[PDB]
Structures are given as C-alpha cells and as structure tokens.
Amino acid sequence: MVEEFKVTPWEVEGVVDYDKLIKHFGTSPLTEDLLEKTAELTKSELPIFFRRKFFFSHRDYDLILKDYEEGRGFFLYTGRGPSGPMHIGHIIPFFATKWLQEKFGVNLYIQITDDEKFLFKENLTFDDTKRWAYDNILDIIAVGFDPDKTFIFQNSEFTKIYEMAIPIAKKINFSMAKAVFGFTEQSKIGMIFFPAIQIAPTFFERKRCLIPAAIDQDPYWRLQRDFAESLGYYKTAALHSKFVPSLTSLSGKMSASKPETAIYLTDSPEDVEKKVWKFTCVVFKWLEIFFEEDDKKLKERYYACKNGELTCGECKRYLISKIQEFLKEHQRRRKKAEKLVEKFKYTGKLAQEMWNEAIPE
Template sequence: MTTENAQVEEHVLNGVAEDEDVVTPWTVTSVNDSGIDYDKLIKRFGSSRIDDELLTRFEKITGKKPHRFLRRGIFFSHRDMHTILNLYEQGKLFYLYTGRGPSSDAMHLGHLIPFMFCKWLQEVFNVPLIIQLTDDEKAIWKNLNIEDAIKLAYANARDIIACGFNPEKTFIFSNLEHIGNNSAFYQNMIRIQKCVTFNQVKGIFGFGDSDPIAKIAFPPTQAAPAISGSFPFIFKDAKVHCLIPCAIDQDPYFRMTRDVTPRLGFPKPALLHATFFPALQGSKTKMSASDSNTAIFLTDTAKQIKNKINKHAFSGGQATVEEHRQLGGNCEVDISYQWLRFFLEDDERLEQIRKGYTSGEILTGELKKELIDVLQRLVAAHQEAKSRVTNEVIKQYMIPRDLDFKNKARARPEASQLGTASKSETNGTWCDGE
C-alpha cells in the first residue's frame, strides 16, 4: 500500500480523536471557534501548503496575478501543482476537473467557490474543463429516486453554466445519464474497482457493515474523470495530466485515485484544496443546503440577503458600542469579514476594513452593510446571467463532443490577454475572475 493511501486509512472518521477536527466528504466539524485548523489538516492529509514561492512561480509562468482565492489562502493546499506549472511552461497539455453533488435545486454561495476558481483557471491556462454532476451519489446518500436526482443535476447545471464557462472548452455531465452511454468511462470505473480492496475503501471512507453496497461502489465513479481515457471523444488516446480544484473534504477520493492511476498507466491527478466556506452562524461547520438560515442561496432576493446577514451572521464585535470602540472586533471569527475575504476583490479595501474593525473604528452593523452591498450585487448579476441559460444552452454543454483539445490548448494566450474576457464573452456573470 502506498504512503498516501496509508495516510488516508490512518485518519478516517472513526479514528479521529475527540479533540480533533472531523473532515470527511460527508462530515465537517471543528473543535475551535475560528474553524478548521488547516495547518493540522495539511499534516494529517500529507499535502503541501501553497506558499509564496509557488505563487511567485505561478505569476511568472502565467503572466497573471494570482486569483484572490490564492492570494488570501482560500485555496491553501496542493498536490503536484509544480508539475502542472512545469507542463504549462513546456507547452504541454492538461485539463481541469471538478464536480458538484446536486442535493437541492438551489445552490448557495459556498457551492460556487470551485466554479469561480475553475473559470479563472480555464481562462489563464486555456484548457478544457470537465464538470461531473454526481447525481448518483446523492441518490444513494440522500435516498432520492433516480428521476429526482437527475432533475437536481440539471437545475444545478443551470447555475454552474451561469458562471460563464467557455462552451467550446467545457463538458458537463450527469453520472446517471452519461455513464451508460460512455463505455470507456465505465471500463475505467471497473479498472479502478479492481485496484482497491474492500478493506481499503472501508479504511479510506469509514464505511460500516450496514452501509449499502452502492456507497462502497461509488468512489471509483468520482475517480474516473481524473483519467483522460474516460473521455475518448475529447482526448482520443492521449494520457493527459489532470488538475482538480476542490474543497479539502474531497481529498480522500483523490488520494485513492492517485494510488490507482499509475497502475493503470495514467499520471496522478494534481489537486488544489480550498478551505470551507463558513456558515452564517460561524466557522465551526460549513454551510448546509438543507438549512436555509446557514447560507445565502442564489435564488435569494436582495431583501432576504439583507435580513439573513443582519439576523444570522455571527459577529466578532463586542457587546456594546462603547466596548467595541475600546476593544475592537475579532476578524478571525466575524462571518461578515470572512465572507468579504471570498467576494471583495479589492485587497486595499479589505485591509482597510480589517484594520478599521479590529481597532473599533468600524462597527458590526457597518461591516454587515458592506457585505450586504457586495452580495446583493453579486447575486443579482448571477440571477441575470442564469436567466439567459436556456435548455438549449444546457444541452450544448452536456453533449459529448470533441473540444478540439490539442489545437486549442496549445494556443496559449499572451500574458497581457489572460483573464480579460469581455462581458459578452462571459455572459456578464459575476464570477468572471479578477
């Protein structure tokens, strides 16, 4: 067994100490008011921190200032990102892969973080993106019927497409619809299944004896898109490197994948790990699509956004105005500030807010108002973009097709042109990167 796979088995849910954070693909809880201890998580998972050296190299090679998610440590950890930069520097090819488990018809802001980032990466590197909708997973874990799970996948696809992905370089698919029509994908699932023992999958994911066998069989399905051979209509017979931006709780799937892919003759996928987008009530857990008061949903009105922030956003301020003026607020736990780190692009303005709130110059109500203004504009722009995503547009993205990978991926844009797509090119959406 490889070191990576052994590390997974060593830190399954059942083996985590009571005083440690719990991070699995299905459960995220923290013992600290400030949220997950990501330094400890890097050590537990055996990944590498995204440091200044990597960011400097990224900017030098791409000619693009790192995205705010990178600058601010929101994407904080990686596996083999230097390999991806080497490939790009050498003019060689790779592709992006991320996904979404559609558990509700309304996505919230936290769900969009990897898609915002993937859109920016797609523009910077000029590469294809594959988006897997794991409606099969949700049918298993949420006990949905197949038809309802597929409907949720299509509803979520509409929100994802509203981010403005290039349709000529983006393939989105529903597992429940696509796998039966793609023999190469299914064949790779079987190859992966043959490489992972029952004891290994129990150790990696913490499955119990009473879990349905569908859960045990699912991980190879999420692993298969990291193998370029699963998409012969895109990559032909090329064995292409894959880069996966995802939240850190998805890492167990891909540690398993990295153990298997070399045995199948394909390169290990590289990963970029994101921190969790905190719930309105605080950073101890991530948002929940099943509790509307923990999140801002992409269907919320401006009034709903204002009311949720004012009523539910956890404050790092003091009990009274006088105490706050004297002692200042705590940005580490204040949700309004933490959310601004995700969505406010202006670094100087964010630093002004941090200093003002910490010193007591800015009150909690003023900080919440700043966030409300940002989110109202953001969600309104997304809703406008989504209104233009018709059923025909969704079909365009979901038809298996040749993305002209080898020709277009080599046509690397000049550094001065990276990330400068016009509003018409990106559907005018708010998640068009910088």
C-alpha cells in the same frame, strides 16, 4: 497532530484546523513562490482566493506548471453533487476552475454526481436528484466557461463513467474503501462502488489532471494516486480550498442542512438581507474569501471595524451590498445559461467528442 474535528467527503464537523489537516491527509502546502510561478507564467494577476490563500493546499501542482511550460499541457476536472440548491461555498471551486481554463486554455470536465446523492441520501429519490442536477448545471454554466473546452455530464446520463471506473474498481480493495471513506456493514453496495465513479474522470485524457476543490474531497484523490501508474495514467494533481464558514458558526462548514446560515446562489435580495440583519470574525471572512476584490478596502475596513470606527450595522450593510451585487449578476446569467445547456452537455466541441463513445451506428 490532534483529533477533535471531522472532515470527510460527506461531513465537516467542529472547528477545522487546516495546518493539521494538511498532515492528516498528507497534502503539500501551497507555497508563496508556487503562487508567483503561476502569476508570471500566465502573465496576469491572481484572483482574490488564490493570492489571499483561500486555496491553501495542493498535490503535484508544481508538476502541472512544469508540464504546461514544456508544452505537453494538462486538463481540469471538478464536480458537484446535486442534493439540493447550491450555495456560495459550492461555486468557489468553479470560479477557480474558470480562471485556470481561461489562462491555461485547457479542457474541463465537470461531473454531476446525481447517482451519488440518490445513493447517499434516504430522503432523495433518483428522480428529484436529476431535477437538481439541471438546476445546478444552470449555476455552474452561469460562471462562464469555454463552450468548446468544457464537458458537463451527469453520471446517470453519460454512463460511460461506469466503463471508465471498472479498472480502478478492480484495484480498490474493499478493506481500503472502508478505511478511506469510513464505510460500514450498513452502507449500500452503490455507496461502496461510488469512489470508482468519482475517480474515473481523471482518466479522461492521457495528460495530467488538475482538480480544484475543497479539502473535503481529497480522500478520492489519495486512492487515485495509489493506482494511477499501474492503470497507465498520471497521479492526479489537486488544488485544495478552505471552507466558507456559516453566518452564526465558525465550528463547521456552510451547508444546505442549515438554510438559515447559508446564502444560496438562487437567494433573493430580501433573503440576503433577512439572513444577515437577523443575528449578529465571520463578517469579514466572506469578504476576504470571495466578495471584496480590493485589498486596500479590505484592509482598511477590517481595522475600521476592529478598533471601532465603523458601527456593526454599517459594516454588515456593506457585506449585503457585495453579496447582493454578485447574486444579481449570477441570477441574471442563470437565465442566459438556460439556452446554453445543450452546448456544454452535447453539442459543444469537447461534448461531441466525448459522446462519440456511442458505438458506430
């Protein structure tokens, strides 16, 4: 409908209207019955972010469920751009991907775009982008995925994605690249080629693909669906989440560009405290999105704050408690993840199959 905010795979500016964005991008709203269809098919309760509609939009999700119950299955694909340390917003797609692999028992491909973040950022060198890649793996593997149904790879290392991208790189016209991603005459040739690389993992299997991500990554999936059939694959399915807002603002997105308003997965308990205490509804947004896994306590405390039974200080003390408990658990797992990197990258069942794409010798 209206134009005053920006949502690209690299920028999110201004107050985001998710209802308009659903039409701007042409994505289907994740209906109430589609959520209940998953609950009855997996025979379990949906996680916090699904039932509270943090994931608001979808593409061919009804097709994914139809494929599963008819026994032809599917596979999961999500990714991460290692431009620096990860925050709470970056990890939610992976938690959604964890639950989906858990309940449906499907393969998972995780793309670490260390090539992208070198190409798209001037400050960063290719060397330190590979550094953050490893650091980011640790956080991702700390979520807990099936060691035999998951493949985590870097584009610079598992360079087979280049060969996997060439088909679509011949399909994607350059005029339409500039149109979808806003490339200009001043973009780098590596920048212009990259969309082929991010689309490539959808062709890991002949089965249909599901991509749990935030709405900002959608432009890639539109182009995929434009040429999927002519390349002999299914039009990729997607589940789109909203954005985790920053502390001070509601007119943007939690970004590492503003470290003061972002809680990193690697943040200390003192860092959490200092960031929340220091300023001044955002407080309950985070609890609704990720941190309070109880609906009754969420509902009761919100109205206890809205009407004024709870003081502001006691209210954000409760936020700190929740995000401190999660970070303590995550950082503990990070240390345990260090000795599982080889499994998810090389040694594991899926990882071994994929790496057996090196010429027989």
